[PDB]
Amino acid sequence: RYNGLPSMEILGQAAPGKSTGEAMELMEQLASKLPTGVGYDWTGMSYQ
Amino acid sequence: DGTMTQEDISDYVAANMKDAISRTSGVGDVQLFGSQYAMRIWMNPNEL
């Protein structure tokens, strides 16, 4: 659970040459196409 | 759109909104103008 709601933590990294900013932006773009009632958030290192 | 009563709205606010708002930056006390749904067993004394 994350912030009082059921969650599933996903770890990953940016592919060689690409920054974390671009990798995170794509993950957001992919997260937007997910089924109704499924949100997302950044934690730990990604929150900072 | 007239699909939810104020009891339904009160439950949604209590169950989905209140907890996150109560943990939001700078928020002290949070008061719900309504009540969260419980499983109500309305007993009939004639049938008991």
mmCIF file with all atom_site columns, C-alpha atoms in Angstrom:
data_model
loop_
_atom_site.group_PDB
_atom_site.id
_atom_site.type_symbol
_atom_site.label_atom_id
_atom_site.label_alt_id
_atom_site.label_comp_id
_atom_site.label_asym_id
_atom_site.label_entity_id
_atom_site.label_seq_id
_atom_site.pdbx_PDB_ins_code
_atom_site.Cartn_x
_atom_site.Cartn_y
_atom_site.Cartn_z
_atom_site.occupancy
_atom_site.B_iso_or_equiv
_atom_site.pdbx_formal_charge
_atom_site.auth_seq_id
_atom_site.auth_comp_id
_atom_site.auth_asym_id
_atom_site.auth_atom_id
_atom_site.pdbx_PDB_model_num
ATOM 1  C CA . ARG A 1 1  ? 0.000   0.000   0.000   1.00 0.00 ? 1  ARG A CA 1
ATOM 2  C CA . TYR A 1 2  ? 1.230   3.570   -0.869  1.00 0.00 ? 2  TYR A CA 1
ATOM 3  C CA . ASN A 1 3  ? -0.348  6.662   0.856   1.00 0.00 ? 3  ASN A CA 1
ATOM 4  C CA . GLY A 1 4  ? -3.187  4.469   2.283   1.00 0.00 ? 4  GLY A CA 1
ATOM 5  C CA . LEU A 1 5  ? -4.204  2.914   -1.119  1.00 0.00 ? 5  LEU A CA 1
ATOM 6  C CA . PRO A 1 6  ? -3.351  -0.550  -2.584  1.00 0.00 ? 6  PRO A CA 1
ATOM 7  C CA . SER A 1 7  ? -0.155  -0.240  -4.749  1.00 0.00 ? 7  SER A CA 1
ATOM 8  C CA . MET A 1 8  ? 2.590   -2.229  -6.603  1.00 0.00 ? 8  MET A CA 1
ATOM 9  C CA . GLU A 1 9  ? 6.169   -0.751  -6.572  1.00 0.00 ? 9  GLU A CA 1
ATOM 10 C CA . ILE A 1 10 ? 7.903   -0.881  -10.045 1.00 0.00 ? 10 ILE A CA 1
ATOM 11 C CA . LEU A 1 11 ? 11.735  -0.352  -10.233 1.00 0.00 ? 11 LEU A CA 1
ATOM 12 C CA . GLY A 1 12 ? 13.516  0.559   -13.527 1.00 0.00 ? 12 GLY A CA 1
ATOM 13 C CA . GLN A 1 13 ? 16.287  2.776   -15.036 1.00 0.00 ? 13 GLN A CA 1
ATOM 14 C CA . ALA A 1 14 ? 16.853  4.938   -18.186 1.00 0.00 ? 14 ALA A CA 1
ATOM 15 C CA . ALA A 1 15 ? 18.472  3.020   -21.131 1.00 0.00 ? 15 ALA A CA 1
ATOM 16 C CA . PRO A 1 16 ? 22.081  3.979   -22.095 1.00 0.00 ? 16 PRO A CA 1
ATOM 17 C CA . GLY A 1 17 ? 22.347  7.573   -23.497 1.00 0.00 ? 17 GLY A CA 1
ATOM 18 C CA . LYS A 1 18 ? 18.874  8.705   -22.230 1.00 0.00 ? 18 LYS A CA 1
ATOM 19 C CA . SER A 1 19 ? 18.354  10.741  -18.973 1.00 0.00 ? 19 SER A CA 1
ATOM 20 C CA . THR A 1 20 ? 15.987  9.747   -16.068 1.00 0.00 ? 20 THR A CA 1
ATOM 21 C CA . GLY A 1 21 ? 13.686  12.699  -17.054 1.00 0.00 ? 21 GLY A CA 1
ATOM 22 C CA . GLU A 1 22 ? 12.866  11.116  -20.484 1.00 0.00 ? 22 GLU A CA 1
ATOM 23 C CA . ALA A 1 23 ? 12.469  7.570   -18.971 1.00 0.00 ? 23 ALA A CA 1
ATOM 24 C CA . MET A 1 24 ? 10.078  8.917   -16.232 1.00 0.00 ? 24 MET A CA 1
ATOM 25 C CA . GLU A 1 25 ? 8.125   10.942  -18.909 1.00 0.00 ? 25 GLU A CA 1
ATOM 26 C CA . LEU A 1 26 ? 7.552   7.736   -21.019 1.00 0.00 ? 26 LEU A CA 1
ATOM 27 C CA . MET A 1 27 ? 6.468   5.732   -17.880 1.00 0.00 ? 27 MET A CA 1
ATOM 28 C CA . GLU A 1 28 ? 3.862   8.552   -17.301 1.00 0.00 ? 28 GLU A CA 1
ATOM 29 C CA . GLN A 1 29 ? 2.774   8.331   -21.021 1.00 0.00 ? 29 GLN A CA 1
ATOM 30 C CA . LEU A 1 30 ? 2.440   4.481   -20.674 1.00 0.00 ? 30 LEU A CA 1
ATOM 31 C CA . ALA A 1 31 ? 0.662   4.842   -17.244 1.00 0.00 ? 31 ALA A CA 1
ATOM 32 C CA . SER A 1 32 ? -2.020  7.151   -18.849 1.00 0.00 ? 32 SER A CA 1
ATOM 33 C CA . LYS A 1 33 ? -3.127  4.306   -21.253 1.00 0.00 ? 33 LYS A CA 1
ATOM 34 C CA . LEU A 1 34 ? -3.840  1.851   -18.325 1.00 0.00 ? 34 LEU A CA 1
ATOM 35 C CA . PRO A 1 35 ? -7.378  0.686   -17.308 1.00 0.00 ? 35 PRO A CA 1
ATOM 36 C CA . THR A 1 36 ? -9.926  2.989   -15.507 1.00 0.00 ? 36 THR A CA 1
ATOM 37 C CA . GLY A 1 37 ? -9.220  3.495   -11.742 1.00 0.00 ? 37 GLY A CA 1
ATOM 38 C CA . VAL A 1 38 ? -5.411  2.849   -12.055 1.00 0.00 ? 38 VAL A CA 1
ATOM 39 C CA . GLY A 1 39 ? -3.264  5.899   -11.079 1.00 0.00 ? 39 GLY A CA 1
ATOM 40 C CA . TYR A 1 40 ? 0.500   6.276   -10.336 1.00 0.00 ? 40 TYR A CA 1
ATOM 41 C CA . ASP A 1 41 ? 3.029   8.314   -8.244  1.00 0.00 ? 41 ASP A CA 1
ATOM 42 C CA . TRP A 1 42 ? 6.854   8.739   -7.803  1.00 0.00 ? 42 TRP A CA 1
ATOM 43 C CA . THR A 1 43 ? 8.544   7.761   -4.452  1.00 0.00 ? 43 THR A CA 1
ATOM 44 C CA . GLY A 1 44 ? 12.078  7.553   -2.905  1.00 0.00 ? 44 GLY A CA 1
ATOM 45 C CA . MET A 1 45 ? 14.734  8.797   -5.423  1.00 0.00 ? 45 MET A CA 1
ATOM 46 C CA . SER A 1 46 ? 12.057  9.758   -8.068  1.00 0.00 ? 46 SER A CA 1
ATOM 47 C CA . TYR A 1 47 ? 10.196  11.924  -5.436  1.00 0.00 ? 47 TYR A CA 1
ATOM 48 C CA . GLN A 1 48 ? 13.485  13.845  -4.720  1.00 0.00 ? 48 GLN A CA 1
ATOM 49 C CA . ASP B 2 1  ? -25.924 14.053  -13.107 1.00 0.00 ? 1  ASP B CA 1
ATOM 50 C CA . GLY B 2 2  ? -28.282 12.861  -10.272 1.00 0.00 ? 2  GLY B CA 1
ATOM 51 C CA . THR B 2 3  ? -26.742 9.316   -10.001 1.00 0.00 ? 3  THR B CA 1
ATOM 52 C CA . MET B 2 4  ? -25.406 9.791   -6.382  1.00 0.00 ? 4  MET B CA 1
ATOM 53 C CA . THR B 2 5  ? -27.342 10.834  -3.197  1.00 0.00 ? 5  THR B CA 1
ATOM 54 C CA . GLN B 2 6  ? -25.577 13.013  -0.522  1.00 0.00 ? 6  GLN B CA 1
ATOM 55 C CA . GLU B 2 7  ? -25.147 9.758   1.542   1.00 0.00 ? 7  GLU B CA 1
ATOM 56 C CA . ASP B 2 8  ? -23.290 8.240   -1.507  1.00 0.00 ? 8  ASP B CA 1
ATOM 57 C CA . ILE B 2 9  ? -21.202 11.495  -1.898  1.00 0.00 ? 9  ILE B CA 1
ATOM 58 C CA . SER B 2 10 ? -20.423 11.503  1.903   1.00 0.00 ? 10 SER B CA 1
ATOM 59 C CA . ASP B 2 11 ? -19.207 7.829   1.689   1.00 0.00 ? 11 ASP B CA 1
ATOM 60 C CA . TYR B 2 12 ? -16.989 8.532   -1.408  1.00 0.00 ? 12 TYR B CA 1
ATOM 61 C CA . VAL B 2 13 ? -15.437 11.656  0.286   1.00 0.00 ? 13 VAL B CA 1
ATOM 62 C CA . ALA B 2 14 ? -14.897 9.640   3.547   1.00 0.00 ? 14 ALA B CA 1
ATOM 63 C CA . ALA B 2 15 ? -13.515 6.499   1.765   1.00 0.00 ? 15 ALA B CA 1
ATOM 64 C CA . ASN B 2 16 ? -11.449 8.047   -1.129  1.00 0.00 ? 16 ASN B CA 1
ATOM 65 C CA . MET B 2 17 ? -10.663 11.770  -0.339  1.00 0.00 ? 17 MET B CA 1
ATOM 66 C CA . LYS B 2 18 ? -10.544 12.451  3.480   1.00 0.00 ? 18 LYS B CA 1
ATOM 67 C CA . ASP B 2 19 ? -7.441  10.318  4.435   1.00 0.00 ? 19 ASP B CA 1
ATOM 68 C CA . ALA B 2 20 ? -5.159  11.802  1.674   1.00 0.00 ? 20 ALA B CA 1
ATOM 69 C CA . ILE B 2 21 ? -6.413  15.402  2.432   1.00 0.00 ? 21 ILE B CA 1
ATOM 70 C CA . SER B 2 22 ? -5.779  14.754  6.210   1.00 0.00 ? 22 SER B CA 1
ATOM 71 C CA . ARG B 2 23 ? -2.102  13.776  5.401   1.00 0.00 ? 23 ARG B CA 1
ATOM 72 C CA . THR B 2 24 ? -1.669  16.743  2.922   1.00 0.00 ? 24 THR B CA 1
ATOM 73 C CA . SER B 2 25 ? 1.083   19.363  3.705   1.00 0.00 ? 25 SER B CA 1
ATOM 74 C CA . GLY B 2 26 ? -0.061  21.934  6.349   1.00 0.00 ? 26 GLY B CA 1
ATOM 75 C CA . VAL B 2 27 ? -3.497  20.294  7.074   1.00 0.00 ? 27 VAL B CA 1
ATOM 76 C CA . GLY B 2 28 ? -4.324  20.030  10.831  1.00 0.00 ? 28 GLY B CA 1
ATOM 77 C CA . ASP B 2 29 ? -7.828  18.633  11.665  1.00 0.00 ? 29 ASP B CA 1
ATOM 78 C CA . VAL B 2 30 ? -10.274 17.491  8.874   1.00 0.00 ? 30 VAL B CA 1
ATOM 79 C CA . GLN B 2 31 ? -14.074 17.385  9.627   1.00 0.00 ? 31 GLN B CA 1
ATOM 80 C CA . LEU B 2 32 ? -16.441 15.354  7.329   1.00 0.00 ? 32 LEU B CA 1
ATOM 81 C CA . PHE B 2 33 ? -19.852 17.115  6.820   1.00 0.00 ? 33 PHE B CA 1
ATOM 82 C CA . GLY B 2 34 ? -21.604 13.704  6.547   1.00 0.00 ? 34 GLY B CA 1
ATOM 83 C CA . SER B 2 35 ? -20.712 10.049  7.424   1.00 0.00 ? 35 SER B CA 1
ATOM 84 C CA . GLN B 2 36 ? -18.820 7.081   5.830   1.00 0.00 ? 36 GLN B CA 1
ATOM 85 C CA . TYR B 2 37 ? -21.047 4.036   4.972   1.00 0.00 ? 37 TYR B CA 1
ATOM 86 C CA . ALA B 2 38 ? -21.142 1.160   7.520   1.00 0.00 ? 38 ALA B CA 1
ATOM 87 C CA . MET B 2 39 ? -22.966 -2.217  7.136   1.00 0.00 ? 39 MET B CA 1
ATOM 88 C CA . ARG B 2 40 ? -26.285 -1.210  8.850   1.00 0.00 ? 40 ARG B CA 1
ATOM 89 C CA . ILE B 2 41 ? -28.332 -4.139  10.348  1.00 0.00 ? 41 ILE B CA 1
ATOM 90 C CA . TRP B 2 42 ? -31.810 -2.583  11.079  1.00 0.00 ? 42 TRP B CA 1
ATOM 91 C CA . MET B 2 43 ? -33.414 -5.149  13.493  1.00 0.00 ? 43 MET B CA 1
ATOM 92 C CA . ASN B 2 44 ? -37.223 -5.823  13.643  1.00 0.00 ? 44 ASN B CA 1
ATOM 93 C CA . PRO B 2 45 ? -38.217 -6.682  17.271  1.00 0.00 ? 45 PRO B CA 1
ATOM 94 C CA . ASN B 2 46 ? -41.500 -8.423  16.149  1.00 0.00 ? 46 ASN B CA 1
ATOM 95 C CA . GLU B 2 47 ? -39.447 -10.910 13.999  1.00 0.00 ? 47 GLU B CA 1
ATOM 96 C CA . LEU B 2 48 ? -36.749 -11.388 16.747  1.00 0.00 ? 48 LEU B CA 1
#
